């Protein structure tokens, strides 16, 4: 059997135009190229979260990844939130969301941006996402808090949006009334 392994050098950095492009919708049934890319994206996240592996493979921990970060302008994202959501989503799409807002108190990370960016990124506390798995099955799941934030951060990627685009540079920690900060 064979497969490629994502290395930190395969992950493009802020400044690369591919990160600003609206990714392309993928065709169904899924090609094997697309199925393999997903398995590759998911193996990465899991490996980056395992001390021994992450260290030997020199990987920076992550909980979500989008194809554009690998310089592949396709609507594919993977998430491995440490308990529990672990899956690859093809052509993900948010159908609805809560009024209630939330944000990560420690701020959002991004394997593609090396600089530190102060501020809070306000997002929807709850969302309903529809997507296709590697088997072609369609899904509709309700997510919230950390997982909702992760998926929102990843889908932004397939639409060419970076997390700091949501941060008011002059009022970085601006928060409306009632925002839930997770941390
Ligand atoms: Fe990111
Ligand atoms: Na690759």
TrEMBL record:
Keywords: Hydrolase, Iron, Metal-binding, Protein biosynthesis. One of its GO terms (molecular function) is metal ion binding. This is Peptide deformylase. PANTHER family: PEPTIDE DEFORMYLASE (PTHR10458), PEPTIDE DEFORMYLASE 2 (PTHR10458:SF8). GO terms for biological process: translation. The active site is at residue 154. The keyword Secreted does not apply. Binds 1 Fe(2+) ion. It catalyses: N-terminal N-formyl-L-methionyl-[peptide] + H2O = N-terminal L-methionyl-[peptide] + formate. Fe cation binds at residues 110, 153, 157. It comes from the Bacteria. Belongs to the polypeptide deformylase family. It holds the Pfam family Pep_deformylase. Its cofactor is Fe(2+). Fe(3+) binds at residues 110, 153, 157. Its EC number is 3.5.1.88. It is an enzyme of class 3 (hydrolase). Removes the formyl group from the N-terminal Met of newly synthesized proteins. Requires at least a dipeptide for an efficient rate of reaction. N-terminal L-methionine is a prerequisite for activity but the enzyme has broad specificity at other positions.
């Amino acid at each position: 059997g064979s497969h490629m392994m994502i290395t930190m050098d395969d992950i493009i950095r802020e400044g690369n135009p591919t990160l600003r492009e609206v990714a392309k919708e993928v065709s169904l049934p899924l090609s094997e190229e697309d199925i393999s890319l997903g398995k590759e994206m998911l193996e990465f996240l899991k490996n980056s979260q395992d001390p021994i592996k992450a260290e030997e493979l020199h990987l920076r921990g992550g909980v979500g990844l989008a194809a554009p970060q690998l310089d592949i302008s396709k609507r594919i994202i993977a998430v491995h939130v440490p308990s529990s959501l672990s899956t690859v989503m093809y052509n993900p799409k948010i159908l609805s969301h809560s009024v209630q807002d939330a944000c990560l108190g420690e701020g959002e990370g991004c394997l593609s941006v090396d600089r530190e960016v102060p501020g809070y990124v306000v997002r929807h506390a709850k969302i309903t996402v529809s997507y296709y798995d590697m088997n072609g099955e369609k899904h509709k799941i309700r997510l919230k808090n950390y997982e909702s934030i992760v998926v929102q951060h990843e889908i932004d990627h397939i639409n060419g949006v970076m997390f700091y685009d949501h941060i008011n540079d002059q009022n970085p920690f601006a928060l409306k009334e009632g925002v839930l900060v997770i941390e």
